[PDB]
Symmetry: D2
Subunit: 260 residues, 4 copies
């Protein structure tokens, strides 16, 4: 038996096999978890069904976190199939491209700010409410991904750095609120990894090349290592850890100035 | 001839004689600065006109930071009068009443999140964009107010924690964007202060009494030490300080666990 | 197999069955690890022989970290039995009772300060150096314990706060130095736990009680939960992690102010 | 008059006209402070009398911070002239050369650890204790200098980072220990400036080049910009500010990764 024998986990935000969430899906399944999966939109449905089956899963649901009623239904639809759940993994984030390309002051407009924070920060609080019942059942847990662009400035990150800072404070507030029920809320801050949201971004190459040089382990981290770190926080080995941001970035955050 | 002699400062967020905005206006004036002012809406037009008079000022303009026209217009209006400005002081913050009262997961709703972040965080960026031409002239600087509820959970603060965390990251993103022009960007993390944004609230009472016991100096902060600290971060004595979050809370944030 | 099958770990700082290093050992053996052990003075030896016998181990050595030869010695003595080690686990700390018993200014003399930083902080840098040859073979990994009394004031803790601050800086620096050799350095900020360090102290309970009231999971943490976190940080599941301070304190570090 | 109208201030650690101590003293004298100085060893005495002459001071005393006797005497010898005192500025920092030149794990020996901590971290505590009676009288304040080597890795800083972290904790433990006598205790974390610590070192030249590139204000900071921030923390404008590490580094600390 694996560490999560006969446990249930919903995984929000699986678009491709390069995803962080795919790396998280692998790891949990490896340790004998039973996965459910949400999809954002009808175009993604067939691919998420293929990914679901790859993890021996037939529990797929449409959930666009921009809509309230999709969040409510997607967990009311899950409540039919499962009478409880051990963890929900939030691995969602978005910003309009125009707010990510350039200098923060000019391109950061109201509507792009409003979306960044809605999808990337409020979805997690929305999802935490719509899960609270099925989580209370098994004293389950929450996991989200964040980026250190929130604590310190990173080129081009811009309005995401704010929406990610909102989300990390939001982790600590969910943790205190849901603590009394036995639910743990945690996040991982991942180093840069090549996925869909990095597709063809030219900054990303140089920026990964910089992260590789600056980091203490002299390499960029893998979706495998983010998967294993997530698993730990989704497991009973992390029962004393709530409210935590776990940096999985080779120790890049700890470096103030690199020799060359 | 005080420290700020023949300098100009727009002060955004004066609603009463209790306000941190008021305290800041007092000490900047007390050092010989030419203040301009803004007011949210028509109902607060007279009271601010009255508070404007007090500091030799007649440069009062309408600014609801919810609307994009009103932000840009009021920064043209001022550009007729002034051809330069040494500082802008953001001191605006709002969240709907039901978001600041209950269980975080239970009470915190999509629009309440949108609104809180929109007024309490994006307004700062929007004002920095609008204020950018004038500040370029004098190589001036920005200042906003934040609360350590972002960094560590406080009771009944909830989504404002998420909104302040977003604002504080914003301060750093601005610090880097506008730093090429000598424009500084800082914030003050004020202890709790009975100002207008706590009246009718019986929790805030208990909150000030706790703060007095935990704080090292064993006393709350009113608005004149927050005012004098804003004076400092707005003076040429802080020419080397940008992107800072200065804690004006008589040490509260350093205490891990206070005796009883 | 267990996760740590065919892996070797040294455990420095086993005093009693209340100890954290004791708890750590139980976790590591439970997943198939072959432990070594150390003892500081002659009076401890047989108790450490007996704890080592409980984990199927006759690798028990003298290592008083006050003495350089005794640190240099044991890692030559270990070098006979093992060609390569998968990690040292530093779990040593000390301060003269009189320094942890009163007002910080009144009681913090030069020798107290000297011992505190020598045993609790410096030692980790020495035992990193002594252990580096055996660590490079299997790309092993270090791990010390710390208390959040470094980052915020806890009453009585006093000089150990400055020692732990030094130690946590010790971690980030070693992590950069030894990263090049593939080595991971990490710490755990454990919540307060009743162990032989507190045995005689009245005020520690009132401190343990406070933690339970403030912490979001409303409970203290066990040497098991610390132990299980230390297993994860010593494994291939934490290969993407170095320089981290992982809080295992049921989320006490996230709360600025708790209901009552 | 200026801000510090007939206040008294002690300045430990003026080495030359390039020192921060000197630069602070200057800015403190500008606002009407009567200054007293100390010197370390018999060589520096004339130079420190020569400098103390520049600012109106014949109050100059011998104080090697390695020795307890000269601390208790220096504050007994000051107590003759001055009945009370308004602040003590601690600009003392020292580590061996060998410890600040190489790989961290190799060059850090027990004695170099003990010197770096004992001088750069304990000296600040020891002086606060001797200076209590005089400080208590005028409800005076303490200031110290630190480097963000404590919080993140800057190359070749090595064991000093452990001492600056140790120090930065002591600022908090002293802020809460001496807080009940209305004594404020703060530190300035200063950007890199060329001083007598930098003289002879060649890495320093390169480290300022990068710090200028990275820092949002595109410039290093001046002893006058550190002077005027110290002034603020030693003044009545900072009465709500204790236990603070104020960054005066052109916002370098706020940058995760600079473009280029
Ligand atoms: N890429 C990195 O190196 C990195 C580093 C740190 C943190 N992260 C975080 O990891 C998370 C996962 O991103 P990723 O790296 O796997 O990239 P990704 O683009 O594959 O993942 C983001 C996911 O968000 C989903 N999503 C977008 N809008 C949605 C909506 N309205 N409703 C529902 N789902 C929606 C997408 O379908 C997608 O699967 C993000 O929140 C990101 O900020 C990534
Ligand atoms: N009082 C505290 O405990 C404390 C501590 C730290 C920081 N802060 C923050 O400092 C700032 C100042 O608050 P305050 O203490 O002066 O209270 P306040 O109510 O006097 O000030 C808030 C200001 O925001 C303005 N405002 C609200 N909604 C607006 C809108 N739609 N458009 C434009 N202006 C709008 C109000 O007119 C008012 O002037 C806020 O951001 C607050 O959150 C408060
Ligand atoms: N228990 C807590 O509240 C707590 C919380 C966080 C961190 N910590 C830290 O974790 C570590 C483990 O503490 P513990 O709870 O296991 O206490 P413990 O007393 O059970 O273990 C401390 C160990 O340090 C050893 N030690 C003391 N002086 C030594 C010396 N000169 N040379 C070598 N070894 C020496 C002791 O003999 C013992 O084995 C310490 O560094 C402590 O500061 C403790
Ligand atoms: N300049 C920078 O780059 C920089 C940046 C951040 C922090 N700092 C810190 O600021 C402080 C001032 O450094 P500086 O730039 O003026 O260099 P400096 O060497 O000129 O000043 C340090 C002072 O410490 C004194 N000192 C050393 N050992 C002593 C002892 N045993 N007893 C008494 N006095 C002793 C010296 O006499 C000297 O005046 C130090 O703590 C330094 O670590 C410097």
């Amino acid at each position: 038996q694996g560490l999560l024998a006969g446990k249930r986990f919903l995984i929000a935000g699986v678009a491709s096999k390069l995803s962080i969430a795919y790396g998280i899906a692998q790891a949990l399944h490896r340790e004998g978890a039973e996965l459910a999966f949400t999809y954002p939109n009808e175009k993604l449905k067939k691919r998420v069904d293929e990914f679901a089956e790859q993890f021996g899963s037939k529990l797929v649901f449409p959930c666009d976190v921009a809509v309230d009623a999709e969040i409510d239904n997607a967990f009311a639809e899950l409540a039919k199939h499962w009478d409880g759940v051990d963890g929900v993994v939030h691995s969602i984030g978005f910003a309009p491209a125009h707010t990510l390309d350039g200098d923060f002051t000019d391109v950061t407009d109201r509507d792009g700010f409003k979306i960044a924070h809605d999808i990337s920060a409020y979805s997690f609080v929305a999802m935490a409410r719509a899960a609270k019942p099925l989580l209370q059942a098994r004293q389950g847990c929450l996991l989200t991904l964040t980026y250190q662009g929130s604590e310190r400035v990173m080129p081009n990150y811009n309005v995401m750095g704010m929406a990610k800072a909102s989300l990390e404070a939001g982790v600590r507030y969910l943790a205190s609120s849901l603590g009394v029920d036995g639910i743990r809320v945690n996040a991982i801050s991942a180093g840069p990894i090549r996925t869909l949201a990095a597709s063809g971004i030219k900054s990303f190459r140089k920026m990964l090349d910089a992260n590789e040089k600056v980091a203490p382990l002299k390499r960029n981290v893998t979706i495998e290592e983010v998967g294993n770190a997530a698993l730990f926080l989704c497991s009973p080995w992390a029962s004393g850890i709530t409210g935590e941001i776990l940096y999985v970035d080779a120790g890049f955050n700890t470096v103030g100035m690199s020799q060359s």
